[PDB]
Design a protein that fits this description.
It is classed as apoptosis inhibitor/apoptosis. This protein has 121 residues and is of the alpha+beta class. 36% of the residues lie in helices and 21% in strands.
């Protein structure tokens, strides 16, 4: 069993409209859904789901932001997977990840998992 994901809580049509509106309001920011990997139980759940990221940052910067928001220990390793099993290079600009890996609804989906969870998998 797993809690409903964002896609299971919000219809495709609702999601498409969310993004249409937010691209008009914040056209220099990428709309991102950040969720805990299915079955990851070590790392905490984020308080929020829908985020906006300035479109000039690279993946390394976003990873830093997420680690900080999750309040991880510095030596707690994790993985960020997009669209949502694909690895990304930390040097990749977020606008490049967006345009290559965005969902059909216009969100970029990401999940995070621990090195432990990732390792035994």
């Amino acid at each position: 069993p797993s809690e409903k994901t964002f896609k299971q809580r919000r219809t495709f049509e609702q999601r498409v409209e969310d993004v249409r509106l937010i691209r008009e309001q914040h056209p220099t920011k990428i709309p991102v859904i950040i969720e805990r990997y299915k079955g990851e139980k070590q790392l905490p759940v984020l308080d929020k789901t829908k985020f906006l990221v300035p479109d000039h940052v690279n993946m390394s910067e976003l990873i830093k932001i997420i680690r900080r928001r999750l309040q991880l220990n510095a030596n707690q390793a994790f993985f960020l997977l997009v669209n949502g099993h694909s690895m990304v290079s930390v040097s990749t600009p977020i606008s490049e990840v967006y345009e290559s890996e965005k969902d059909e609804d216009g969100f970029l989906y990401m999940v995070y998992a621990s090195q432990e969870t990732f390792g035994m998998k």
